[PDB]
């Protein structure tokens, strides 16, 4: 009788009460640098991780006390806490709301000011690069890291270049993959280097991976950073340079085709445009409309990826369907 | 081979992609003024709702046509459109990824001062409380207003008081419902009251239903506003003035118990800290963080809030369960 009212209520609502705060937690806690020390396989020790992060172990203390309350972590003893068991799926989906919601925050408020003076609103409203790279690395960890982690695996590469790389995590993975490799990871923006720095040093990878602070734009003019590589990934980032810098963009991929071991192949994961089918097409839409509307940079459907791979010497091309929603694979040899 | 990766992807990333999409196009919608305009039985009309919005009529097109590739909305015309058939359940969805990602933004991003610095914290990052209310009226949708509404149609009430009312949603949905009613809705914000008031004229209510822009404190000393009413309600206000201001709490509740009508009641949704069953304990340690950690507001158990009410005056006091995790509907009489 409100019984009912009870079982439609709860029905109505479904996983989103459940995602809503594992997103709101885990961007606070990862704002706070505390996420990086979650793991269900290792423990979080309050009394070091509160120094080393600066802050107030009282503090700290209850924020995990919350999080336990809301089964993300686990109390091992005292300040001992690990991760609860789905914790990486928890964090993946959580993911794409920090990036929906957060990375893109200044397009949702101002989007008025987009609407009638584009140039002013562009240069006003700025994201946090910090913000985009964390988002999108949650996302890759299940969505689009697996498929081009394991084709890369494959032909156990020495040297292993990705332009746009964020916070390195592709390369991380790479090079704890295949015993001797070594990695570059290019990317224009302060924040996610800095970022990238960390989490390097942290899997202790400081020596063989290298990150290096410059545009994609960069490597047109001055490929030396690419020679000697067995495979080069470029995440997302392809987009940046069109449609203004088609000249720049066409040159960085013919110096990618000199650059590259006789074996080896470019790889490119990016975005396809307004997909319709119904599994692609909600999150297709939002990743479309920022980059159109907001960004004004253009994103190339797969039939016009492959031919612009095509006639710039590559042969052997092929297209692959990521999880990730418009996401795609490239392999070009 | 690459296609178990892509079961594997589609699997760990479940419904929170749509859900990203769905959240960020709706929040943006709502802030230019556009969501108001959508129902799945109404037509948006460009050229009319463009210019009632002061909005570039091309820019609001690109907007629609984005949502109508989500998915969200159907092309009816030339310049008209419609909500899909399940817009009112997405929206509701939207409403708790809005409330804990965007209206609690201030929260997530200076955790560190509040942790270090409470006061100077607490005045240098405030909410918008545009956000807090219209976020809550979409969880209310379906979530926590069902239930209290239809207590309410019941003994068919002439003068209903609504207290913390927000942008007025249950008092419209009330004065909706029974042919010949009156509604007062008490909100101490500005930015809810001048959104009410709209919602209230869009309603065509505007002459039953009076907005009055007043601290539920208020009250305790001027309780000309209640005298005459069947029923008082407040949703999730009562808590803003504990633990500090206790004495004022039992003024406006013994002012309550005053000016009702004999036969009425007192109807308070609130919400109760950190329940561990598993279907609520996540979202209720959101909720729950949020206002001990953050606004320092006391949340009281349903045992507390029963004895409450009982050494207030009132008898024949129950408590209902609501599909809102963590919210519960107190009856007294
Ligand atoms: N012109 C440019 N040159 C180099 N990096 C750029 C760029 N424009 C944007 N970027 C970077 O490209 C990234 C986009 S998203 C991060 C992608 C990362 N490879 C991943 O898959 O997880 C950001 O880190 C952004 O700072
Ligand atoms: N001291 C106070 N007096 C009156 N209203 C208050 C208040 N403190 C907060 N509020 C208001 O209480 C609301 C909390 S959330 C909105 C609740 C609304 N009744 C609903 O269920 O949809 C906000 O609108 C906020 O501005
Ligand atoms: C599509 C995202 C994964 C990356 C991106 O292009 C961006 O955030 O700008
Ligand atoms: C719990 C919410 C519905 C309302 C609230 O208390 C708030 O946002 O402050
Ligand atoms: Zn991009
Ligand atoms: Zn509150």
């Given at each position: 009788?409100?019984?009912?009212?009870?079982?439609?209520?709860?029905?109505?609502?479904?996983?989103?009460?459940?995602?809503?705060?594992?997103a709101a937690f885990l961007?606070?806690?990862?704002?706070?640098?505390?996420?990086?020390?979650?793991?269900?396989?290792?423990?979080?020790?309050?009394?070091?991780?509160?120094?080393?992060?600066?802050?107030?172990?009282?503090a700290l203390v209850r924020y995990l006390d919350a999080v336990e309350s809301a089964?993300?972590?686990?109390?091992?003893?005292?300040?001992?806490?690990?991760?609860?068991?789905?914790?990486?799926?928890?964090?993946?989906?959580?993911?794409?709301?920090?990036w929906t919601m957060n990375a893109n925050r200044p397009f949702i408020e101002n989007a008025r000011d987009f609407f009638t003076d584009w140039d002013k609103a562009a240069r006003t409203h700025v994201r946090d690069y910090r913000e985009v790279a964390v988002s999108s690395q949650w996302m890759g960890s299940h969505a689009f890291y697996p498929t081009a982690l394991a084709t890369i695996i494959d032909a156990a590469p020495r040297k292993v270049v990705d332009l746009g790389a964020g916070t390195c995590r592709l390369l991380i993975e790479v090079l704890g993959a295949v015993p001797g490799s070594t990695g570059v990871?290019?990317?224009?923006?302060?924040?996610?280097?800095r970022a990238a720095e960390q989490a390097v040093a942290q899997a202790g990878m400081t020596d063989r991976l290298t990150v290096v602070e410059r545009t994609i734009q960069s490597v047109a003019t001055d490929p030396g950073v690419l020679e000697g590589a067995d495979v080069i990934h470029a995440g997302f980032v392809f987009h940046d340079m069109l449609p203004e810098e088609e000249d720049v963009?066409?040159?960085?991929?013919?110096?990618?085709?000199?650059?590259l071991a006789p074996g080896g192949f470019l790889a490119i994961?990016?975005?396809?445009?307004?997909?319709?089918?119904?599994?692609?097409?909600?999150?297709?839409?939002?990743?479309?409309?920022?980059?159109?509307?907001?960004?004004?940079?253009?994103?190339?459907?797969?039939?016009?990826?492959?031919?612009?791979?095509?006639?710039?010497?590559?042969?052997?091309?092929?297209?692959?369907?990521?999880?990730?929603?418009?996401?795609?694979?490239?392999?070009?040899?």
């Open positions: 009788i409100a019984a009912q009212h009870l079982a439609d209520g709860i029905a109505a609502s479904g996983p989103a009460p459940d995602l809503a705060a594992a961007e606070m806690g990862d704002r706070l640098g505390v996420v990086a020390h979650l793991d269900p396989d290792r423990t979080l020790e309050t009394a070091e991780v509160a120094a080393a992060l600066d802050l107030p172990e009282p089964g993300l972590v686990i109390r091992e003893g005292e300040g001992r806490y690990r991760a609860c068991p789905d914790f990486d799926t928890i964090r993946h989906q959580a993911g794409y709301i920090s990871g290019l990317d224009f923006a302060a924040d996610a280097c963009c066409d040159q960085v991929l013919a110096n990618c085709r000199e650059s994961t990016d975005a396809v445009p307004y997909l319709r089918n119904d599994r692609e097409r909600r999150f297709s839409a939002a990743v479309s409309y920022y980059h159109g509307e907001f960004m004004r940079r253009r994103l190339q459907s797969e039939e016009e990826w492959v031919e612009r791979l095509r006639g710039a010497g590559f042969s052997d091309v092929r297209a692959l369907t990521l999880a990730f929603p418009t996401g795609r694979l490239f392999l070009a040899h």
